[PDB]
Symmetry: C2
Subunit: 121 residues, 2 copies
């Protein structure tokens, strides 16, 4: 067990999320965004006006990688924005397309949300 | 609405969760001169034992994979002998999440829908 469980999880966590970012990455083209860039936005928009601290931590990024991405998202003029807040809807929508692409009912999603929420708890 | 809500949730949770995981392999991997990805590569190179078929099972641009395999260092005959301490790192890592062996398998039952 212990050997082959912790090994499955390893391959599974890698691959499953490896393919999740893949689908995200296609949709995010329409906006010239990196999946990581996307994540930052979704976070930014729920808090708004947060130090690179409450943010850099909430997105698990060292001040080193976050600064350049913040700058980038700024030239993009999504953060520096009113246009940014405009696409909150179509961006959010991307999370729905991505998981539908995996045939996930709201039943499967809930079950996963709970397993993952505990895992990370 | 709800479909939007749950996606949001799955998204954040998958992102946040794979961050906590990689972060932990990062520590433990220092023993070897390996990177997290360099580690999945090895774990994969070991499960299979073709380069373009590898970039695929491991999901990496051969523009990012080429450097990596070269390195992998004699990791071979001693890569086999080193295969269990390797394996144990996954145990060391997932054990830090203090989860039961059932929940452990649940996550596996769930994580499959993202492979099927």
């Amino acid at each position: 067990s212990h050997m082959y469980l912790s090994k499955q999880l390893c391959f599974l966590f890698y691959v499953s999320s490896k393919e999740i970012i893949k689908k995200y990455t296609n949709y995010l083209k329409e906006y010239d965004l990196t999946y990581t860039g996307y994540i930052v936005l979704m976070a930014i928009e729920n808090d708004e006006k947060l130090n690179i601290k409450k943010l850099g931590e909430r997105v698990f990024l060292d001040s080193g990688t976050l600064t350049p991405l913040l700058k980038k998202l700024e030239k993009k003029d999504y953060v520096v924005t009113e246009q940014g807040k405009a696409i909150k809807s179509p961006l959010a929508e991307i999370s729905v397309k991505v998981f539908n692409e995996f045939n996930i009912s709201e039943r499967e999603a809930s079950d996963i949300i709970n397993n993952l929420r505990n895992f990370v708890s």
